Amino acid sequence: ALPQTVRIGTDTTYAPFSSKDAKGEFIGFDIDLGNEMCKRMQVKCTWVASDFDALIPSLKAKKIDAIISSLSITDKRQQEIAFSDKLYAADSRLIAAKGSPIQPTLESLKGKHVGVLQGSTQEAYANDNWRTKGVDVVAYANQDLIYSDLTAGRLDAALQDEVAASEGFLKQPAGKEYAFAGPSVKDKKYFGDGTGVGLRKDDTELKAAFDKALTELRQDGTYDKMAKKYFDFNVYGD
Ligand SMILES: N[C@@H](CCCC[NH3+])C(=O)O
Numbered sequence: 001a002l003p004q005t006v007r008i009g010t011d012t013t014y015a016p017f018s019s020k021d022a023k024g025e026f027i028g029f030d031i032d033l034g035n036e037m038c039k040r041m042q043v044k045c046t047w048v049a050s051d052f053d054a055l056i057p058s059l060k061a062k063k064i065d066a067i068i069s070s071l072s073i074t075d076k077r078q079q080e081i082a083f084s085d086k087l088y089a090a091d092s093r094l095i096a097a098k099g100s101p102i103q104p105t106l107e108s109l110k111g112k113h114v115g116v117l118q119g120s121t122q123e124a125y126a127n128d129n130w131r132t133k134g135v136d137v138v139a140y141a142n143q144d145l146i147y148s149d150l151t152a153g154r155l156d157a158a159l160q161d162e163v164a165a166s167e168g169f170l171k172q173p174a175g176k177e178y179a180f181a182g183p184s185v186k187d188k189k190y191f192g193d194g195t196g197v198g199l200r201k202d203d204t205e206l207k208a209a210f211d212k213a214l215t216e217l218r219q220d221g222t223y224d225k226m227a228k229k230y231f232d233f234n235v236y237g238d
Contacts, residue, residue, distance in 0.1 A: 001205060002041065002043055002205060002206055002209055003043065003065060003206075004043070004044060005043070005044045005045065005046055006038065006041075006043050006044070006045045006046075006065045006066055006206070007045075007046050007048055007063070007064040007065045007066070008034050008045055008046070008047050008048065008064060008065065008066045008067070008068055009047075009048045009049075009050045009055045009058055009059065009063075009064035009066070009067050009068075009069065010026065010030060010031070010034075010047060010048070010049060010050070010055075010067070010068055010069040011049070011050060011051060011052040011055065011069045011142065012026060012049045013142035013143045013144045013145075014028075014069070014070055014143050014161075014164050014168065015028060015164070015167065015168035016028050016029055016163075016164075016167045016168055016230045016231075017029050017030045017069075017070045017163075017164060017168075018030045018031060018068075018069055018070070019168075020049075026047045026049070028230075029088075029226065029227065029229075029230050029231075029235070030068045030069060030070065030087075031047065031068075032226045032229070033068065033087055033214075033217075033223075033226065034047070034066075034068045034197075036213075036217050036222060036226065037197075037210055037213040037214060037217065038213075040212075040213035040216055040217060041209045041210070041212075041213050043209075048063075048064050050064075051118075051119075051141055051142060052069065052117055052118065052119045052120065052142065053118045053119025053141075054119075055067045055069060055071070055119075055198070056077070056080065056081060056119075056198065059081060059198060059199075059200060060080070060081070060200065062200075065199070065200075065203070065206065066197050066198065066199050066206065066210070067081075067197065067198035067199075068087070068197050068198075069198075070090060070161055070164065070195050071083075071195050071196065071197075071198045072090055072121050072191060072192040072193075072194070072195050073086065073192045073193050073194060073195065073196045074121060074190070074191070074192030074193075075189070075192070076124075077192070077198070080201075081198045081199060081200065081201060082198075082199045082200065082201045082203070082204075082207055083196035083197065083198060083199065083207075084196045084197035084199065084207055084210040084211050084214060085196060085211050085214055085215075086193070086194035086195065086196055086236070087194065087195050087196055087197065087214070088194060088195055088227075088235045088236050088237070089194045089195075089235065089236060089237025090161045090162070090163065090191070090194060090195050091161070091162045091184040091185075091186070091191070092121070092122055092125070092159055092160070092161060092162065092184060092185045092191050093159075093160075093161075093162040093165060093180050093182075093183070093184045093185060094114075094157050094158070094159050094180065094181040094182055094185070095150070095157065095158050095160075095165045095169070095170065095175075095178055095179065095180055095181060096150075096156060096157040096158075096178065096179070096181040097156075097177060097178055097179075098177050098178060098179045099179075100156075100157075100179075100181055102156065102157050102181040102182070103181060103182045104159075104181065104182045104183075104185050105182075106129070106130060106133050106135065109130060109135045109156075109157065110133065110134050110135055111134065111135070111136070112135060112136065112156040112157060113136040113138055113154065113155050113156050113157075114126060114130065114135055114136065114137050114138065114155065114156065114157045114158065114159060115138050115140055115146040115149060115150065115155040115157070115158040115159075116137060116138070116139055116140070116146075116158070116159050116160070117139070117140055117142065117143050117146065117160060118139040118140060118141060120160070121190050121191050121192060122159040122160055122161075123137075123139050124190055125159070125185070125187060125190040125191070126159055128190075138155065143160060143164065143168075146158045146160070147169050147174065147175075150178065151174060151178075157181060159185070162180075162184055163231070163235065165180070166180075167230065167231070194237065197210050223236070
């Protein structure tokens, strides 16, 4: 008994995973994976755009049936929702102006203004570790606002998923004068293990269908065909 239409929520400000083109159509690797899985599940799927911090509330309230939005699988989130198997890996990394001395450390960042997406694992990490100790951690409604304020000089640094910053900003016109500041921030407790489809705990039939379709499209080589459209390295990690 899967729904006739599966309603999938995503936050369309995280290119190359989820964004909108000039006509307002949904585009990106998350959209490609969701649509291929819906095709293999033989269900119809509707995409619903939402701010990132409204996604798990909307899911719990049944306004959407699944979340595909670079949603990291963490211990905290598993207390509330269920996840498909891993869609791809996601590490966190700081970005700042080229030549910046900034490092992901308290000593480097105390007194700096650091942007993080509201509702993200990065906001959790930065609030506990940095905001309490005097770093000015600023939470934003979406990631595009973070990049705009960084280039405006209102932020000194921003923490987000590494590949989103790389492909969605650093390799773009707008990020030419910016770079990663230090290596990926590893913290198992905060950042979890890769991203997955977020689902209500009791929708075990829907999880089984997403997991089976994901195995099948990885198996026959469709995942790698799709990933190569955006990435030249293995995004899945393994
Ligand atoms: N992967 C991070 C950021 C995803 C942001 C997507 N708009 C998290 O799960 O919180």
